[PDB]
Design a protein around this ligand. Structure first.
Ligand code: NAG
Ligand code: NAG
Ligand code: NAG
Ligand code: NAG
Ligand code: CA
Ligand code: CA
Ligand code: CA
Ligand code: CA
Ligand code: CU
Lengths: 265, 166, 416, 463, 161
């Protein structure tokens, strides 16, 4: 009998969002601007692999393909297309304990072995894993053991950088050879300070630390290619709201007709 | 379970029909029954699941027209010049699901690995040889296979059954 | 036919295939048609009952005749009385290092260890007349991507050392030389741009494929049976003792015996895990299955070889290499070329097998060279025309690659 | 890029001193920025090729207790840790003499004078070498599952024949030889729909006597005294003969035939000819070695009129919907359950057979197929002295308590079994070896009643 | 979930998979033989036999023995609930590894068809059995008089908790 009464479960959630921002299961937040095919998360802790999720970006840090192997089922998610075992399917689609459903903002794949994948319309990928997979996974989401740095950024008593770790988590295509991203020097570049530290997210500060997301918002504001500075930080705020919801908090509405508007059917 | 065997005389395991409606049961009772209908030659009625069920039919000379065998879900129909397995004609020799059907110069033999051998010879004789594990568990024209000729075959309720009635 | 009807004879009838079936019978006697005494049934030809001396024999599905003979590379058999009488003949042995990790010893034992050091392939145990070393090194991010970077042939107690690198460079006694070389007890030449062949006078021959990856085929004369020892076994026709280390016992795993033939202490000890690379990527598995299944396709480009060489091991090597290594096409081409070379060694030619995949090497040789699927001769040169003798081993397993066209001689500046 | 004087193509990587350096854009970039100068503990000293005099190997010819070849092969200098002159590394950082290196066997180290057991012989470590006796002993032919065969000489193959096949027999060439003629014959039956076939009954013809092991019972068909000894130990039924032939039968599909060395080169059948050579074990009944497994198997059918077998379909390809389950069930052979045995028995062929049988066991009884496949590897592990426990209440349970009499608790599961357990036929408690690791339920008789009567199947004070 | 797809009518398990059908019947005949002869007058085995055959026909993805064991254990529990404790498990028919629970050197766990509603434990020290559960068969401990208490927290026989 296992008891769990703490709703805060950010430790079982890994996500990617914005300009190549990755949050591991253990809470580590880094930036890896890789456009290749990488292992998002796979079950390497056992002889038989229950799941294997890979994500690929394109160029606009937008995801182009998500590949899932869930107990003999191969699910490929492309923009406006879902393939199960190589054939196109019409959502909602249920097969072999895997349920794929589309909504006005996300595409969700739920696997009864205890995994949830959410590809949001903000080009953000989120993954909820069961606690039974702790200390048994690998990929860009960490080893899922609780320690943010141990056994992920340590190859052999060596402190790995996020670039090195992300390149280590690469899994390329047969005929598609990919070049690792070139580490670029900083560009030497505070809107996010008002909203993130304001009362609008106050009921969320006590549960999820904002420093990492503050840095992520600064990076997104500096790295994005249009001068919609008020509307170019929606992704980081949405990710912070998602993490607050996953932490047992109750975020209040922060959008508006002119500030990051969302359209509902 | 170790079972010893020394006597090679195994006439108690063999039932056959030949000639002018002559029948020999597993227990050694030889009688005549001039029936031209479809009759149960031998079937495994002593268990919840039936391992085998063999039926034979005669047509007029007392010729044998059809032999129907149900062997563990395999249906074999033997007619003059035709062998059907699950409703499909087959070319002999034919091996499937532990059942081997082979034709020789004088007979057609169906061997079932569960322990039965059926011989349809060219002098119009149908001979069945059963494994000893089926003793006291069969019924049909070949008797109940318990080593006693009259008891449990010619008795319905304490009475005596003539060979025609049986 | 001439069978007779009897009331009591054994149902186990003796035939040409089984001439002692009656003796090994468990059923009682029955009535039926039986062959006359002194004759057995002819099941091969269905010609009734024939005497034992007239019984035919069946080999590879083809019926032979009494007195007819067939021959393999290792034996010579003759049919008599329905049975094959076989005599052994001298038979050279073949060791193979393919893909940098797949080893097949002289006795046919096959294993797969991903080493990270220089290892002793073949060597006499009681002498140092010759010694072959392989530099198997990890050439990828993971520990299961091994490349054969060089092959070392040592002769007469390291008095003649030839190092052949994966880039085609040849070093004789630490001096970068130019092929062909006729050194002490060894001749090394280049039949094509794809292969380097080194033949020694001790009964040893090395075929080294350099395109796309370095692979080795060693051939040993029958005079060295039971005398060599290394990663290629002791060449004594027994597979059980091919994992016997120099200590004296036979190991149970390929990795444990493999790690005992290191040459340096700092080299890691390889432990064989149970990884399945094809399971780690959908696209890689699809590519490997699509392009490697041609080895086992009976009606494909390699179908004319399934009787000579069994393609199962080559199919497994193709799948593993294609799914594991980063350059999937290179490893797929290496596996296909290894199977083609084995077929050519068996005497089967599979020309035209590069249509569909591995097309690139056919269009990469120098300006005056052209590709050839079958190269069983030696390259003619201007020096060969002048002197009259060409430095070659005359007889070698046919190879493929880009050579000078017919009627054209290779000039000293690498031009036809 | 160039490393150690060797050209490294772009995209390739090298592994030096635990550092992985990849060659990209003509530059060798190492994981972790730069490899730090490695430091070797005393008495090993780091030798570098900066001051490399001609003819000096450095660390390129430094040997260890694992490098059994002491010849120096390096032509050029290689940096690394070097022990003092005339010393070799022991794998723990120290330096010892070559004669003092411990012996290595199956990923283990044994000091001088330690004893290991291979086959029937005993090997003692002595100055890096193994001293072993040269006593010949038996060979085991193992047939299990959907026609998985391993011959006396070690030839492993898969054959799916529907008829009765001669597993082993003597008097093959010349038909006279010596001894008394024996013949072990397997009876097969289709098991699945993909074309696979598994054994149903085993018939042993010895002298004028016949034993039929079928279902779960033995029949003495018979015709002197009976030259058989039937003994139920563990899950196995052991038939012992006085000619040197032992048969282990798991009572469902598995047979293990142990043949004494006196029968070398005098046997034939699907189990080979027992002459230490595995390639020639594919000898047909026409006495010709063939390459086709189907032809060799079909040549050994008892009845020439039985139809010849054909190549079956790939089970996991014909039945993909089961494949995952198979791969999820047979992964026990790769997990921590058998981790101690991976160094002594290679599980590759056992895992392949397990997956194939689970894929092909589509007509009913998947658990029996899986349990037989795993028990083959379990018996292989037990034969070499590894008492590995793998049966859980969810994985192939055994109902030992079924054998407990009313108000008694004696029967317990034994992985390696009880070789010498006191019984009526063995009052002194003797064990002849020759059978190892027969797992199953064995009785633990109390001191009050210490003799196990098999016929009564009870613990009694005296028989 | 309203968004979850509706379930459709499944195929006939013994028609889609006829090659299993015979086995299924031969496996499920235990529900009609002498094994459950005493229970046949108290629990009707018709629907249980039908479910057994259908499950064995449809258990084609792996683990048909689990399907068969569950189908027969349903009828076994129905029999046990009405006072009839039949012993149907054999080493070849749904074996139970009770010996797995024996501590090193001990022999306590036995298979009980009826179950032991009031075995003595330290959560019910007196030994009172609450009823309300009948015939929960399986492995139960028989603690010796030296240690007549069964501790489930540590799972062994002890004198007191
Ligand atoms: C995760 O597993 C490794 C495996 O040895 C272990 O060393 C480590 O302590 C584990 N971490 C946690 C948090 O349990
Ligand atoms: C055959 O079955 C009947 C019916 O119970 C029984 O009375 C008789 O004793 C049995 N005979 C033998 C030989 O078992
Ligand atoms: C086998 O050897 C004999 C005698 O040396 C020879 O005549 C015969 O041709 C050989 N077999 C073949 C197939 O050449
Ligand atoms: C060739 O080998 C033989 C035997 O190993 C040796 O006697 C001879 O000297 C070698 N040739 C040369 C040129 O050294
Ligand atoms: Ca960690
Ligand atoms: Ca009677
Ligand atoms: Ca050998
Ligand atoms: Ca042999
Ligand atoms: Cu959540």
């Amino acid at each position: 009998v296992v008891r769990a009464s703490n709703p805060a479960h950010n430790g079982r959630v890994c996500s990617t969002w914005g300009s190549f921002h990755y949050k591991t299961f253990d809470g580590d937040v880094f930036r890896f601007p890789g456009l290749c095919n990488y292992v998002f998360s796979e079950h390497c802790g056992a002889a038989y692999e229950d799941f294997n999720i890979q994500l690929r970006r394109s160029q606009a840090p937008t995801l182009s393909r998500v590949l899932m192997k869930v107990d003999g089922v191969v699910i490929q998610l492309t923009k406006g297309s879902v393939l199960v075992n190589g054939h196109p399917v019409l959502l909602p689609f249920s097969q072999s304990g895997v349920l794929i459903q589309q909504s006005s903002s996300y595409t969700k794949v739920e696997a009864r072995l205890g995994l949830v994948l959410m590809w949001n319309h903000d080009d953000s990928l989120l993954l909820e894993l069961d606690t039974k997979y702790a200390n048994k996974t690998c990929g860009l989401c960490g080893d899922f053991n609780g320690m943010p740095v141990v056994s992920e950024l340590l190859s052999h008593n060596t402190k790995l950088t996020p670039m090195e770790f992300g390149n280590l988590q690469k899994m390329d295509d047969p005929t598609d050879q990919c070049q690792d991203p070139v580490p670029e020097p900083p560009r030497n570049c505070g809107i996010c300070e008002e909203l993130l530290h304001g009362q609008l997210f106050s009921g969320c500060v006590a549960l999820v630390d904002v420093g990492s997301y503050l840095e992520a918002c600064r990076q997104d504001l500096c790295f994005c290619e249009d001068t919609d500075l008020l509307s170019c930080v929606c992704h980081t705020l949405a990710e912070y709201s998602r993490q607050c919801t996953h932490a047992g908090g109750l975020p209040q509405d922060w959008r508006g007709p002119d500030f990051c508007p969302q359209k509902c059917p | 379970p170790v079972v010893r065997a020394s006597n090679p005389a195994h006439n108690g395991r063999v039932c056959s029909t030949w000639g002018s409606f002559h029948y020999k049961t597993f227990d050694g009772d030889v009688f005549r029954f001039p029936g031209l209908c479809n009759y149960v030659f031998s079937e495994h009625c002593g268990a919840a699941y039936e391992d085998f069920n063999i039926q034979l039919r005669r047509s007029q000379a007392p010729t044998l027209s059809r032999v129907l065998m149900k062997v563990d879900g395999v249906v074999i129909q033997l007619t003059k010049g035709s062998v059907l397995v699950n409703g499909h004609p087959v070319l002999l020799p034919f091996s499937q699901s532990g059942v081997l059907i082979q034709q020789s110069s004088s007979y057609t033999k169906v061997e079932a690995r569960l322990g039965l051998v059926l011989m349809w010879n060219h002098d119009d004789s149908l001979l069945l040889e059963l494994d000893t594990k089926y003793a006291n568990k069969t019924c049909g024209l070949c008797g109940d296979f318990n080593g006693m000729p009259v008891v449990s075959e010619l008795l319905s309720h304490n009475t005596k059954l003539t060979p025609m009635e049986f | 036919n001439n069978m007779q009807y009897h009331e009591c004879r054994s149902p186990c009838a003796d035939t040409c295939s089984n001439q002692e079936h009656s003796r090994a019978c468990e059923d009682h006697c029955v009535a039926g048609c039986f062959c006359p005494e002194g004759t057995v049934l002819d099941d091969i030809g269905q010609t009734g009952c024939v005497p034992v001396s007239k019984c035919a024999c069946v080999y590879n599905g083809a019926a032979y005749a009494p007195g007819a003979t067939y021959s393999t590379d290792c034996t010579n058999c003759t049919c008599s009385g329905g049975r094959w009488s076989c005599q052994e003949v001298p038979c050279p042995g073949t060791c193979s290092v393919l893909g940098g990790a797949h080893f097949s010893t002289f006795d046919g034992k096959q294993y797969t260890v991903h080493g990270d050091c220089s290892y002793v392939l073949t060597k006499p145990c009681d002498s140092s007349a010759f010694t072959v070393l392989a530099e198997l090194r990890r050439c990828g991010l993971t520990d299961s991507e091994t490349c054969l970077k060089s092959v070392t042939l040592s002769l007469d107690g390291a008095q003649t050392v030839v190092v052949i690198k994966a880039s085609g460079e040849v070093f004789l006694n630490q001096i970068y030389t130019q092929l062909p070389i006729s050194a002490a007890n060894v001749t090394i030449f280049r039949p094509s741009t794809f292969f380097i062949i080194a033949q020694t006078s001790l009964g040893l021959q090395l075929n080294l494929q350099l395109v796309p990856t370095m692979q080795l085929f060693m051939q040993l004369a029958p005079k060295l049976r039971g005398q060599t020892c290394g990663l290629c076994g002791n060449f004594n026709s027994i597979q059980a003792d091919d994992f016997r280390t120099l200590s004296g016992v036979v190991e149970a795993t390929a990795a444990a015996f493999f790690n005992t033939f290191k040459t340096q202490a700092a080299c890691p000890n390889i432990r064989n895990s149970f990884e399945d690379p094809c399971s780690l990527s959908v696209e890689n598995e699809k590519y490997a299955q699509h392009w490697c299944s041609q080895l086992t396709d009976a009606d494909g480009p390699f179908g004319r070889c399934h009787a000579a060489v069994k393609p199962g091991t080559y199919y497994s090597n193709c799948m593993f290499d294609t799914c594991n290594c980063e350059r999937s096409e290179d490893c797929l081409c290496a596996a296909l070329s290894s199977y083609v070379h084995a077929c050519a060694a068996k005497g089967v030619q599979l020309g035209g097998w590069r249509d569909g995949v591995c097309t690139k090497p056919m269009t990469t040789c120098p300006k005056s060279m052209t590709y050839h699927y079958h190269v069983s001769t030696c390259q003619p040169t201007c020096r060969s025309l002048s002197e009259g003798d060409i430095t070659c081993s005359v007889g070698f397993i046919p190879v493929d690659g880009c050579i000078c066209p017919k009627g054209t001689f290779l000039d000293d500046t690498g031009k036809c | 890029c160039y490393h150690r004087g060797s050209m490294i193509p772009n995209g390739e990587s090298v592994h030096d001193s635990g550092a992985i350096c990849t060659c990209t854009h003509g530059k060798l970039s190492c994981i972790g920025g730069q490899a730090p100068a490695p430091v070797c503990a005393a008495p090993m000293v780091f030798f570098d090729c900066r001051n490399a005099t001609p003819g000096d190997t450095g660390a390129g010819c430094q040997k260890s207790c694992h490098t059994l070849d002491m010849t120096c092969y390096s032509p050029q200098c290689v940096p690394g840790c070097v022990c003092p002159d005339g010393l070799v590394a022991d794998g723990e950082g120290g330096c010892i003499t070559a004669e003092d290196c411990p012996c290595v066997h199956n990923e283990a180290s044994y000091r001088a004078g330690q004893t290991i057991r291979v086959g029937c012989n005993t090997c003692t470590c002595d100055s890096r070498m193994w001293r072993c006796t040269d006593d010949p002993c038996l060979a085991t032919c193992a047939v299990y599952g959907d026609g998985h065969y391993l011959t006396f000489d070690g030839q492993s193959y898969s054959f799916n024949g529907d008829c009765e096949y001669t597993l082993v027999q003597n008097h093959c060439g010349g038909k006279d030889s010596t001894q008394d003629s024996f013949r072990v014959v397997t009876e097969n039956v289709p098991c699945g729909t993909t074309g696979t076939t598994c054994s149903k009954a085993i018939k042993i013809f010895l002298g004028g006597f016949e034993l039929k092991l079928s279902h779960g019972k033995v029949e003495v068909i018979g015709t002197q005294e009976v030259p058989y000894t039937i003994r139920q130990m563990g899950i196995y039924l052991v038939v012992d003969t006085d000619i040197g032939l032992v048969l282990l039968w798991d009572k469902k599909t598995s047979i293990f035939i142990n043949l004494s060395p006196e029968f070398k080169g005098r046997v034939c059948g699907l189990c080979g000819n027992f002459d230490d050579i595995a390639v020639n074990d594919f000898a047909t009944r026409s006495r010709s070695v063939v390459g086709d497994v189907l032809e060799f198997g079909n040549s050994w059918k008892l009845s020439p009129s039985c139809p010849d077998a054909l190549a079956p379909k790939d089970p996991c390809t014909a039945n993909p919907f089961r494949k995952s389950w198979a791969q999820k069930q047979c992964s026990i052979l790769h997990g921590p359950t058998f981790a101690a045995c991976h160094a002594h028995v290679e599980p590759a062929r056992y895992y392949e057979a397990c997956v194939n049988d689970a894929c092909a066991c589509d007509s009913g009884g998947d658990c029996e197929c899986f349990c037989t496949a795993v028990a083959a590897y379990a018996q292989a592990c037990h034969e070499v002295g590894l008492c590995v426990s793998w049966r859980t209440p969810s994985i192939c349970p055994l109902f030992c308590d079924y054998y407990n009499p009313e108000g008694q608790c004696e029967w317990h599961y034994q992985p390696c079994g009880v070789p010498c357990l006191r019984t009526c036929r063995n009052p002194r408690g003797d064990c002849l070896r020759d059978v190892r690791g027969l797992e199953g339920c064995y009785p633990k008789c109390p001191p009050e009643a210490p003799i196990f009567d098999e016929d009564k199947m009870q613990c009694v004070a005296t028989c």
